[PDB]
Design a protein around this ligand. Structure first.
Ligand SMILES: [Zn+2]
Lengths: 157, 210, 464, 35, 416
């Protein structure tokens, strides 16, 4: 029995609503990679970098940055929420790294609407279990992508 | 009260006997508290997984063991608890409904599995899986249709409480006054997902819904 | 072929039996077809004997056995026809079964190669085998008929009902073989997806017959066989067929309700079904009544139609006002048979003027008295009260009329003892004119009594 | 109803099927000659 | 003819002197349907004593009609004036013999036919009315003189012993029990019919049979016959002692009020009839291992398991007929592979994988499906196991293009 946290929505659904409103396909990045190389999953390590790097250059990742500002009634509230988001994602990055959290896909990442905080769920894969599996072994300590790093502040991370 | 109830329901005999010994000691000073907790715990787990939910997971796991792992003794041990709960009789209309649509096929398939343990012919076990797979297809076609549950249909005992001295789960501290469970909503919603979680809304003693 | 009918019986027999083998060389299929017809005509002349028709029975079966293996459906059809005229007594049937001819008879049942003439001859042989000796029916033929009936609709087989009618006949003289092969399950599953009034009545009657005699109830389980027909109403999400098209999914549910409704009515008019569905312990009638109280609109609108047909009450029209529905149930409503073209006054006076008999027992009243008492014992009245005050506007009116009809039916057909707890409605008094309960629910119960009050006036007036 | 003895059950089975079959098969396979 | 019924139900003045006589002439009408309708409305008119007395003084000829006329003629025995007229030419004695051998049991058929026509959707070649047909024993006990004949013949003893000793095994002797329950029920419909019926203590025997009976049809039959006993105040008192209440009012007033009876009675507790004793269910009373560990080609780089000399198409004829023994390691390894795929096809788990494995064998080795013994083994397996219809038709279709020369060669020699 898990309690229900109010005023929070997952990251995957938050981005999905923004793109469909702007008449933008949900999987534009994925479609570009398949268009350039249909057998993307079977490519070698060096070839997947070429396809992945090309996709992120033709699409500018700023959906999350504009999403937060459009949901802020005033600029004073907008700055306060952004500050909380920046320092709440950093705490879970180091704490999660020690715990060895994995499988941090957007469906397991929730952002508080009222306060801008970041909440993690589905603490199933811990202690570097996901890194040693034979099926797609992820080799990153925590999730820090271009979408997240472009919303904390303009100067970067 | 909550951790002990989980221990008392464990399959291990050592944990089961030890947990009950502590529980009966608590019945001296507070007997009505443990009785309500046992009733709530048994009903909540019943709502979480229904009879057709258990069979869908049990048959899928058993099929992988028999055809993938080529294990026969490991297949029977999975299906034994599933057939055991149906021999105690339904306790609600939902269980009664399941015992009518799929009652004959499951009970007959057990008979063929019983003949395999004695005769040893492979054909008896193969004929048993003809009934198991037929039910599995029927159940799999109605799982997506499940999107809402009524308390009267699944568990009549939950909506007939109207008062409890057991505190709301997950909120209890010695430095704060205790808040008890007042009532349970008559309807709960099932979230469309692979695990299909349920949304249960309680009612606190202070008028705040949890 | 030229029928000789001149030489001796052994001489006429040799040509046809020597031409059935032919080593598949030197003889055409046309000659074999003609010779087989000669054998049937010859058998009608000389009686069944091993002394006049040359060789013994066993030799004849051996050569006749080499006729169902032909690649021409015309030759196989004639071979099956010859067997029916040969099998007369149990001695011959046991000899045919000895040579394992059933392996080939069951083969011709399911080939589905545009040979409906061949398949008809095979099934006609089966009915002959059952009549001669039903206690030695082969298990190979039985398993073929079950398969063609259990899964005979998905393959668009046209001879599906012709095989179910044979399983029921076999289930009355040899239930042991049918029970082992799961033949009783096939009949139960057929009534679920059979919406023909006369056929559905016959299929359910066969199963109820096995529950009548004490020595035949051992072939039917306790609470899972007969209660299968209650699944569409008891289960809110019922899937009869694991594999079906999703185009008519909505229409499939309506078809199941219509077919299941006739099954429930059929099993409530037989003593072997009334008792089994109204057992003192856990029974199907309590589940049927219990599911009525659940606030489901689709089930409630279906169960009410079942109750009207069980008691044989005229259905009112769908509306949200009681007055319009009340006028549609009056006994003096006009009918087409009352016109001048039809019975002018004779037809009308029959349904208006009362019968001139005050002491002749009416056996139909006795049947309704027992059925009505069974539902009251299980709590039909309590269930109706919940429906009236907790359902839709057009559903409460139908339940209000049904409750009023039962009260009128029960004050003149039930005895004194059953009337002490009859006109009380303990659950209705709980939801009375009180401010404790919600105000909206308070007036619905009060308005229901006001609406039900006017029903008394209609019966007081009588037909006019 | 008193559909108890097999004498009337057999008649009911072989009459409803023949009368109420859309496909002309029960009219040809349920011939009373074969008894 | 149909318009004389409304005049009967409207209480037209003096209908019994000019309306009855017009229904007697109409009996001899040329059309059978018109005459049949006259009998239907004449039976309804006989419920009044004034109309019944009119028919007796007219003494019509109803013998030449069918069973409908016979039943209407038997109602004259309920009147002392009508009994004397009929029992003067020796008629009651003839009916007693007929109502004991020929159609005493046929009265059950009349009861069942009307109920079947009412609500069964049977139609032997809306709420209807099903009234009890006229019975000879039920009409002869209305007066003391008629009851005297029924006692000297000593028929009650014959019927009572048929109830205390029922044989619920043969369907032909069960109907004899029904033929006695309806006979005893009609006797108990009158006060003078109960005096000689309760002296042998038979009513409790029926009550016991109405709640503890193996055959559920007999249990339901006793419900109706107990209603007939409740047609009198004396009869309803007996049933009340044994916890069987009954309606104590007629039908002429459909609005009973607390202070001739209609036939209806129910137990105080309805569950006392619906109890049935439980009866136990009748069911309660190799190469496969090596094949999965290797490959079909790997092994290559008697085979029939359930093959006995009693259930084979060719082998069973060696002794009875006189056939020759069948003649033939590379082939024995294909029989096992074919059989194991057929067995695995009975589970319907992976049909495509198993169907493909059989088509390849018939392609690479088309001659392996040409032995009669293998076909018998597969045919034998199709009987014990269960297969889907599309999968069952897949088998027995690989053997369609075969010759089976061995059976043809041996059958020709012995037959010639
Ligand atoms: Zn052989």
């Amino acid at each position: 029995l898990i309690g229900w946290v109010p005023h929070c929505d997952t990251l995957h659904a938050l981005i999905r609503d923004y793109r469909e409103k702007k008449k933008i396909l949900l999987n534009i990045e994925h479609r570009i990679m398949l268009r350039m190389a249909p057998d993307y999953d079977h490519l070698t390590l060096m070839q997947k970098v070429e396809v992945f790097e090309h996709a992120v250059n033709n699409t500018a990742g700023d959906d999350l940055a504009k999403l937060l500002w459009l949901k802020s009634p005033s600029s004073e509230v907008w700055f306060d929420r952004r500050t909380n988001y920046t320092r709440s994602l950093a705490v879970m990055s180091m704490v999660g790294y020690i715990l060895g959290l994995g499988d941090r896909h957007p469906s397991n990442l929730m952002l508080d609407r009222l306060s801008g905080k970041i909440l993690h769920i589905d603490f199933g894969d811990c202690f570097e279990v996901a890194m040693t599996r034979e099926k797609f072994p992820e080799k990153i300590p925590f999730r820090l992508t271009r979408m997240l790093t472009n919303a904390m502040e303009v100067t970067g991370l | 009260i909550y951790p002990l109830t989980v221990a008392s329901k464990s399959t291990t005999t050592a944990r089961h006997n030890a947990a009950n010994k502590i529980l009966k000691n608590m019945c001296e000073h507070s007997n009505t508290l443990v009785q309500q907790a046992m009733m709530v715990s048994e009903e909540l787990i019943r709502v979480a997984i229904l009879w057709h939910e258990m069979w869908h997971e049990g048959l899928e796991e058993a099929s992988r063991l028999y055809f993938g792992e080529r294990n026969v003794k490991g297949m029977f041990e999975v299906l034994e608890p599933l057939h055991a709960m149906m021999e105690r009789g339904p306790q609600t209309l939902k269980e009664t409904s399941f015992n009518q649509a799929y009652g004959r096929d499951l009970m007959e398939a057990q008979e063929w599995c019983r003949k395999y343990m004695k005769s040893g012919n492979v054909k008896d076990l193969t004929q048993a899986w003809d009934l198991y797979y037929h039910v599995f297809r029927r159940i799999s076609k109605q799982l997506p249709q499940l999107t809402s549950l009524e308390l009267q249909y699944v568990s009549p005992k939950l909506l007939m409480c109207r008062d409890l001295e057991l505190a709301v789960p997950g909120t209890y501290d010695p430095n704060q006054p205790i808040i008890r469970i007042q009532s349970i909503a008559p309807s709960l919603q099932v979230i469309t997902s692979k695990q299909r979680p349920r949304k249960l809304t309680l009612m606190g003693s202070n008028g705040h819904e949890f | 072929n030229v029928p000789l009918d001149l030489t001796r019986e052994p001489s006429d027999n040799l040509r046809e039996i020597l031409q059935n083998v032919a080593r598949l060389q030197g003889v055409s299929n046309m000659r074999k077809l003609g010779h087989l017809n000669n054998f049937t005509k010859l058998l009608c002349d000389i009686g069944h004997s091993e002394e006049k028709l040359g060789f013994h029975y066993e030799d004849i079966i051996i050569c006749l056995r080499l006729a169902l293996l032909n690649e021409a459906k015309e030759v196989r059809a004639a071979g099956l026809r010859a067997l029916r005229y040969l099998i007369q007594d149990s001695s011959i049937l046991q000899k045919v079964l000895k040579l394992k001819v059933d392996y080939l008879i069951a083969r011709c049942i399911d080939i589905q190669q545009s040979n409906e003439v061949e398949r008809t001859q095979a099934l006609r042989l089966v009915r002959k085998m059952i009549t001669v000796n039903a206690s030695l029916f082969p298990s190979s033929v039985t398993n073929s008929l079950i398969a063609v009936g259990n899964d005979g609709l998905q393959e668009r087989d046209r001879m599906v009902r012709a095989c179910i009618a044979i399983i029921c006949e076999l289930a009355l003289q040899n239930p042991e073989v049918v029970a082992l092969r799961g033949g009783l399950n096939t009949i139960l599953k057929n009534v679920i997806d059979c919406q023909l009034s006369r056929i559905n009545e016959a299929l359910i009657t066969t199963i109820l017959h096995l529950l009548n005699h004490p020595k035949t109830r051992q072939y039917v389980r306790a609470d899972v066989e007969l209660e299968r027909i209650l699944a569409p109403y008891t289960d809110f999400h019922y899937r009869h067929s694991p594999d079906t098209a999703e185009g008519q999914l909505k229409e499939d549910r309506e078809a199941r309700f219509l077919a299941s409704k006739m099954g429930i009515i059929a099993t409530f008019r037989s003593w072997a079904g009334i008792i089994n569905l109204c057992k003192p312990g856990n029974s199907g009638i309590q589940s049927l009544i219990g599911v009525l109280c659940i606030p489901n609109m689709e089930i409630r609108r279906g169960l009410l139609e079942v109750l009207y047909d069980i008691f044989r009450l005229p259905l009112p029209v769908v509306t949200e006002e009681f007055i319009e529905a009340l006028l549609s149930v009056d006994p003096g409503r006009f009918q087409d048979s009352w016109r001048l073209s039809d019975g002018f006054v004779a037809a009308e006076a029959k349904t208006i003027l009362p019968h001139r008999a005050r002491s002749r027992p009416d056996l139909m009243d006795n049947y309704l008295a027992l059925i009505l008492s069974a539902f009251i014992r299980n709590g039909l009245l309590e269930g109706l009260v919940e429906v009236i005050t907790n359902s839709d506007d057009h559903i409460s009116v139908r339940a209000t009329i049904l409750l009023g009809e039962l009260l009128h039916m029960a004050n003149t057909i039930l005895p004194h003892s059953h009337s002490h707890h009859l006109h009380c409605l303990p659950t209705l008094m709980n939801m009375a004119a009180s401010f404790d309960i919600p105000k909206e629910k308070r007036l619905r119960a009060s308005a229901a009594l006001n609406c039900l009050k006017r029903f008394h006036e209609m019966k007081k007036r009588g037909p006019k | 109803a008193f559909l108890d003895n097999p004498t009337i059950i057999l008649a009911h089975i072989r009459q409803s099927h023949v009368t109420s079959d859309d496909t002309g098969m029960c009219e040809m396979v349920l011939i009373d000659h074969d008894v | 003819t149909k318009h004389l019924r409304v005049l009967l139900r409207a209480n037209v003045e003096f209908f019994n002197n000019w309306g009855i006589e017009l229904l007697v002439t109409q009996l001899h009408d040329k059309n059978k349907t018109i005459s049949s309708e006259a009998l239907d409305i004449l039976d309804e008119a006989c419920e009044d004593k004034a109309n019944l007395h009119a028919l007796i003084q007219m003494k019509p000829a109803l013998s030449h009609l069918g069973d409908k006329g016979l039943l209407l003629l038997l109602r004259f025995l309920s009147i002392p004036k009508g009994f004397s007229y009929l029992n003067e030419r020796g008629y009651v004695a003839k009916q007693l013999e007929k109502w004991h051998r020929e159609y005493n049991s046929k009265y059950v058929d009349l009861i069942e036919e009307q109920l079947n026509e009412a609500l069964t959707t049977y139609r032997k070649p809306q709420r209807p009315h099903v009234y009890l047909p006229i019975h000879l024993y039920g009409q002869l006990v209305h007066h003391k003189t008629g009851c005297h004949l029924l006692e000297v013949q000593n028929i009650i003893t014959e019927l009572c012993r048929n109830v205390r000793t029922p044989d619920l095994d043969k369907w032909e002797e069960i109907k004899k029990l029904k033929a006695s329950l309806w006979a005893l029920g009609n006797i108990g419909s009158s006060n003078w019919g109960l005096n000689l019926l309760q002296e042998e203590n038979v009513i409790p025997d029926i009550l016991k049979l109405a709640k503890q009976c193996e055959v559920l049809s007999i249990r339901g039959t006793c419900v109706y016959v107990l209603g007939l006993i409740a047609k009198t105040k004396q009869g309803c008192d007996i049933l009340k002692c044994h916890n069987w209440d009954a309606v104590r009012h007629s039908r002429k007033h459909l609005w009973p009020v607390v202070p001739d009876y209609i036939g209806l009675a129910l137990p105080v507790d309805i569950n006392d009839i619906f109890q049935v004793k439980d009866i136990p269910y009748f069911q309660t009373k190799s190469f496969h291992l090596l094949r999965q560990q290797m490959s079909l080609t790997e092994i290559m780089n008697t085979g029939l398991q359930e093959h006995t000399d009693d259930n084979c198409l060719y082998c069973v004829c060696i002794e009875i007929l006189g056939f020759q023994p069948s003649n033939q390691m590379c082939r024995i390894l294909l029989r096992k592979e074919v059989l194991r795929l057929v067995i695995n096809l009975s589970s319907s788990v992976s049909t495509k994988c198993h169907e493909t494995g059989l088509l390849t064998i018939k392609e690479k080795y088309p001659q392996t499906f040409d032995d009669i013994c293998l076909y018998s083994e597969v045919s034998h397996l199709l009987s014990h196991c269960t297969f889907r219809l599309p999968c069952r038709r897949f088998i027995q279709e690989l053997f369609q293009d075969v010759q089976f020369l061995q059976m043809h060669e041996e059958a020709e020699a012995v037959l010639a």
